[PDB]
Amino acid sequence: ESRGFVENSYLAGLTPTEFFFHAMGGREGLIDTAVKTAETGYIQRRLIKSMESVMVKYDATVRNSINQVVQLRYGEDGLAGESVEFQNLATLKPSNKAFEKKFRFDYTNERALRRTLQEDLVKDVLSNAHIQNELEREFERMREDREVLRVIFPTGDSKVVLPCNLLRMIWNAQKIFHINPRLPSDLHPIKVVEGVKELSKKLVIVNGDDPLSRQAQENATLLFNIHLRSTLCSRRMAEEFRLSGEAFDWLLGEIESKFNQAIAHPGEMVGALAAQSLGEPATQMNVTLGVPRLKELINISKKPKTPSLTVFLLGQSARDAERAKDILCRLEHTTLRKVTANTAIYYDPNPQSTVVAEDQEWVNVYYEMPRISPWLLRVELDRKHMTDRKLTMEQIAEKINAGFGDDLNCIFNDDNAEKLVLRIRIMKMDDDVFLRCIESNMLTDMTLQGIEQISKVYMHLPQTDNKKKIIITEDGEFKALQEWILETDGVSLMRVLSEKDVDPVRTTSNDIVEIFTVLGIEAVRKALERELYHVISFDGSYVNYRHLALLCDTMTCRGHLMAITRHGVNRQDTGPLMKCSFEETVDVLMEA
Amino acid sequence: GAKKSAIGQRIVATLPYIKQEVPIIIVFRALGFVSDRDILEHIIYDFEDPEMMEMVKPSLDEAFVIQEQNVALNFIGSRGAKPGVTKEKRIKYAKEVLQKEMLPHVGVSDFCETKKAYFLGYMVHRLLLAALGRRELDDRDHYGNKR
Amino acid sequence: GRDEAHKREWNLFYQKQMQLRKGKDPKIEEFVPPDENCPLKEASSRRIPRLTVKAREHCLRLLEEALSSNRQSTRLRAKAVELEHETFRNAKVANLYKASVLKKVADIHRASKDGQPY
Amino acid sequence: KRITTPYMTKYERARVLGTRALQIAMCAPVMVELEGETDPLLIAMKELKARKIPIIIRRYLPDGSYEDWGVDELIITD
Amino acid sequence: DDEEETYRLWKIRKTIMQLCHDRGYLVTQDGLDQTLEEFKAQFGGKPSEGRPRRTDLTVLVAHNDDPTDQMFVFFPEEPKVGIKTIKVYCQRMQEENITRALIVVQQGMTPSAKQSLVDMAPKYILEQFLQQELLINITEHELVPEHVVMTKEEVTELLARYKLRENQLPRIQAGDPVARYFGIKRGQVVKIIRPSETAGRYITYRLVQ
DNA sequence: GTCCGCCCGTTGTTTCTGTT
DNA sequence: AACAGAAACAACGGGCGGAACTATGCCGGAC
RNA sequence: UUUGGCAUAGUUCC
């Protein structure tokens, strides 16, 4: 009750303290509503100015006002956004045995043949050999497509967005032609195979006959052709759908018509479309997410508000907590102040008669078997922090020797005694002021362990299917594994990647400038797309991938990061009249 | 660097109508107090506080040079709105600023130094208490701190 | 860049203060060769600067005295010489060599207190 | 050799309809027998359906070239 | 430590072997795949006061299309490589009749040395790689799609097919990490092959400029 | 009818090493 | 010893939502 | 059947 938990409902009413606390709660909502609007409008305006003149040319390429290629095919496939639908691939997830049983078309049992295919067709199937060779080649092609799919889509996601809804088209064909599923059909599986092969030739995105053009078309229609073959497999047609001749012909005609209608029309203003599509969710939008994150990603800064670096471990460190904690120790910065307990500066010229009575025995043992200055620098190390990081006094001593050379002296006790003692002596320029500078440097500059600029490192098991490692078993399924993943504060990507027992493939940060300077421009494009997808989908919202790809390509087209500001807008070699209308009019005009 | 790293923290005062900052011991000496014992009587009320004494020590280490009211006033007045070409006028300007624009609410008469010193010592003492984590920092949105 | 600047300023300050503490003629301590009865392995080795043969002989006696005390408790020269030589081979600087010898002596005394042969 | 798409895009359809309607409204001959219609936009749509609009669309490739497609030759999608 | 230094030398050598294999030079499978113990045995498990002394690890290898065109991989023993070291290396290249060479640096090179490397560009080609930049292979990172260097013939054919002037392609800086990995000069065009979410594959092109 | 409140791209200043 | 290349810190300048509807005061002073 | 502007304040809608 003291900190504001309203026990009553709106029907019973609120006691005065709960009334005031509720008003304090609602004020925050009013403030956020009145605050987000201007920033959202400004972000949308900057995006529109950035991509206002990007168009789809009659060449089918996507070019800006200076005829510089942005995408060779819009959305990497050449289709329009408003004509595509969610669909499932249905050949990626099934195991080996299930996949073979569902897509093989056994022509040997012959009782399933008599039950599903007609009598005049079963004799043909059992007699011919060219038919059998074609039917085996079809399954070979499907297996190769399955492997390609598993490479393209790790983590086993079937859901995909493709232009023609094949299952609903099949349902419509069944209802239109009054197909009875309880009777054998008159569809020849060879007719099915030949029809699909001929159909795939009429779905042309890249027109040409050179090897380059044929390769471009294959890349442009690979996924849809894989889906088409998976759906119109002959065994699936014979078992599940049970179509007929005229039904199959109508289905092929409808597929051609819909694919041809779902192709992007030249002249579209895809740049402005993408700007609006990515900026309209902004008005409804321990790290930063939402409007500030979008602002940072659009105008890239070298100092993000909450830099982070998710780290994946390679082997037994991923499972066993021992090496996990060991890597956690290796990757976290730690100076001497993090472990020291207390320090003091004494005046003790006598090696034997020591002002401090604790060090007597071992300091005498050290001095008995051999100038120097009479002053001292006695420090005391906290036992809890000393033993937490698995540190050793010999390690601290050798680090001090490396850091200062042999112009210092160091004598240290061991963990046997309850008091762990380090004693330092030097082997204008007066001693006391020099020892205070030695202590101050040795406590804020020592860098015993860890990587500089890496402040704090967490260590927690993942709970999401994108931050988990997913493998493919020997039986072909997808199995999800839980392995320890780290999450640091502060970024230094190169050192963490170079560290022993750290996975150099899946390790990633969220600083775009760092990704650039370490991995190039294509990696920065992919990472920028992933960060934008994360910030957009945190709210559960959906935005078509074409708009994300267009924004990322526009930002990373010229080889260096182009922040969407006056700097990036005027860096383009465009006409002065486009730049004058944006964040700098008179200066640009007078320069030109 | 080595000397800044050893010093750590120093206490400075931004007097009005003065070009830039002034160390606090300089102002206290300009008020007419010479002995470190007297200045610490004005600032640290209970001398059995070694942490407070150590915190104020680097501020007193800036008194290694200045030791007299005349030179302290000269140092203060060197940074006026219009720096003078003479020295007596600069020293008179320094005294005028310390008598007219520094803490007007305590007093403006001739014998107000004995109380301006106490109030400035209280300001420094409260700053030390804030730095030691013994009192909560104020918030501007508290409505007892408004008119 | 600020950490690198502060580290350079510190290194210049430190080097200046240590040069004001370095005398004009650092007498290079003369390496006295081992005697004919020196039981040390690699006794003539000058690999560790400022580590004398007499220091290593003293360190070896500490190991012998510790091992002798341990054996008297549990009911030796060759073992002491191997312990010294291993410590010598692993050490780069005289102070760490001495510390690693004293650690071995402490470990032997711990084993003796626990009634265990080292 | 023409490589541009054989369909008439929505923008080409809109501009052709607007220009043909303006031409009709400026007292120009029609290429179809109007069965009672009087609105220039309706008559233009009827002509487009009949494939009798006498316009050739000049499509500019980005490399400076161009292609002339008659309305009769372009598949009318919508 | 000696173990860590051996590990760093081994990792640098392995990455350079992978780099040469990608650049088309002729590196065998056994050279490509060496275990840490095998490297310890072959060239010293003790670096400090041991056989591997950042020398004798230099690699001379011949391109698969021309045994006459060969490349060096030099390991300076100095944390700051200097003008005289660069002159020594250029003398060795001149005497061995070698055009291109790599130089792995402990910490860095002075700007004078870098400019003295740039000056002899038509005479000789030398590249600087830091010790930290080669402990990992940036190409193997999953964020980095496959890059293919395209011949002038492939470039011409591509430009003719799309009717593009080279100004109209996307660009990639000559200081890019992958560009330095492949050793690409200005005016060459790289090809990017990456999988796609909406098409299944997408081939882009970048101009080094 | 006459006079009188926060961020971050440029450019400078200064400094610190390398070559000959 | 003179010169030159590269870098740390400090100062300066431009940038900051979209529409719409009422009202009220003022546009130089002395001679 | 002809056309003032500058500033400030309040309000409506996302």
UniProtKB/Swiss-Prot annotation, chain A:
Post-translational modification: The tandem heptapeptide repeats in the C-terminal domain (CTD) can be highly phosphorylated. The phosphorylation activates Pol II. Phosphorylation occurs mainly at residues 'Ser-2' and 'Ser-5' of the heptapeptide repeat and is mediated, at least, by CDK7 and CDK9. POLR2A associated with DNA is specifically phosphorylated at 'Ser-5' of the CTD by CDK7, promoting transcription initiation by triggering dissociation from DNA. Phosphorylated at 'Ser-2', Ser-5' and 'Ser-7' of the CTD by CDK9 (P-TEFb complex), promoting transcription elongation. Among tandem heptapeptide repeats of the C-terminal domain (CTD) some do not match the Y-S-P-T-S-P-S consensus, the seventh serine residue 'Ser-7' being replaced by a lysine. 'Lys-7' in these non-consensus heptapeptide repeats can be alternatively acetylated, methylated and dimethylated. EP300 is one of the enzyme able to acetylate 'Lys-7'. Acetylation at 'Lys-7' of non-consensus heptapeptide repeats is associated with 'Ser-2' phosphorylation and active transcription. Regulates initiation or early elongation steps of transcription specially for inducible genes.
UniProt binding sites for DNA nontemplate strand: R571
Binding site for DNA template strand: R566
Coiled-coil zones: none
Highest taxon, organism lineage: Eukaryota
Region of interest (Trigger loop), residue spans: 266-294
Location of the region described as Bridging helix in the Swiss-Prot/TrEMBL record: 15-56
Subcellular location: Nucleus; Cytoplasm; Chromosome
Family: Belongs to the RNA polymerase beta' chain family.
Chain's gene name: POLR2A
From Swiss-Prot, chain B:
Compartments where located: Nucleus
Family statement: Belongs to the RNA polymerase beta chain family.
The protein's role, per its UniProt record: Catalytic core component of RNA polymerase II (Pol II), a DNA-dependent RNA polymerase which synthesizes mRNA precursors and many functional non-coding RNAs using the four ribonucleoside triphosphates as substrates. Pol II-mediated transcription cycle proceeds through transcription initiation, transcription elongation and transcription termination stages. RNA-dependent RNA polymerase that catalyzes the extension of a non-coding RNA (ncRNA) at the 3'-end using the four ribonucleoside triphosphates as substrates. An internal ncRNA sequence near the 3'-end serves as a template in a single-round Pol II-mediated RNA polymerization reaction. May decrease the stability of ncRNAs that repress Pol II-mediated gene transcription.
Disulfide bonds: none
Source organism of this protein record: Bos taurus (Bovine)
Protein name according to UniProt: DNA-directed RNA polymerase II subunit RPB2
Residues of the whole record sequence present: 246 to 392 of 1174
Swiss-Prot record, chain C:
Region named Interaction with POLR2A: 1-118
Outcome of mutating Y14A: Abolishes interaction with POLR2A
Region spans: Plays an important role in affinity and substrate choice in DNA binding: 1-109
Disulfide pattern: none
Consequence recorded when altering R56A: Impairs protein folding and abolishes interaction with POLR2A
Membrane-crossing segments per the record: none
Known outcome of mutating K103E: Abolishes interaction with POLR2A
Tissue distribution of the protein: Ubiquitous.
Quaternary structure and partners: Monomer. Interacts with TOP2A, TOP3A and TOP3B. Isoform beta interacts with RNA polymerase II subunit POLR2A. Identified in a complex with the RNA polymerase II core bound to DNA. Interacts (via C-terminus) with POLR1A. Isoform beta interacts with RAD51. Interacts with WRN; this interaction stimulates WRN helicase activity on DNA fork duplexes. Interacts with MUS1; this interaction promotes MUS81-dependent mitotic DNA synthesis.
Domain notes: The alpha-helix immediately C-terminal to the Zn(2+)-binding site (residues 438-453, characterized in C-terminally truncated contructs) is required for helicase activity, is positively charged, and may play a role in DNA-binding and choice of substrates.
Family: Belongs to the helicase family. RecQ subfamily.
The name this protein goes by in its record: ATP-dependent DNA helicase Q5
Species of the source: Homo sapiens (Human)
Shown chain mapped onto the complete sequence: 495 to 618 of 991
Swiss-Prot record, chain E:
InterPro entries for the chain: Arch_Rpo5/euc_Rpb5, RNA_pol_Rpb5_N, RNA_pol_Rpb5_N_sf, RNA_pol_subH/Rpb5_C, RNA_pol_subH/Rpb5_CS, RPB5-like_sf
Record-level GO cellular component terms: nucleus; RNA polymerase I complex; RNA polymerase II, core complex; RNA polymerase III complex
Signal peptide as annotated in the record: none
Keyword entries, A-Z: Acetylation, DNA-directed RNA polymerase, Isopeptide bond, Nucleus, Transcription, Ubl conjugation
Annotated crosslink Glycyl lysine isopeptide (Lys-Gly) (interchain with G-Cter in SUMO2) location: K80
Top-level taxon of origin: Eukaryota
Gene3D superfamilies in the cross-refs: RNA polymerase, Rpb5, N-terminal domain, RPB5-like RNA polymerase subunit
Biological processes annotated in GO: transcription by RNA polymerase II; transcription elongation by RNA polymerase I; tRNA transcription by RNA polymerase III
Localisation per UniProt entry: Nucleus; Nucleus, Nucleolus
UniProt GO molecular function: DNA binding; DNA-directed RNA polymerase activity
SUPFAM superfamilies: Eukaryotic RPB5 N-terminal domain, RPB5-like RNA polymerase subunit
Protein's job: DNA-dependent RNA polymerase catalyzes the transcription of DNA into RNA using the four ribonucleoside triphosphates as substrates. Common component of RNA polymerases I, II and III which synthesize ribosomal RNA precursors, mRNA precursors and many functional non-coding RNAs, and small RNAs, such as 5S rRNA and tRNAs, respectively. Pol II is the central component of the basal RNA polymerase II transcription machinery. Pols are composed of mobile elements that move relative to each other.
Family: Belongs to the archaeal Rpo5/eukaryotic RPB5 RNA polymerase subunit family.
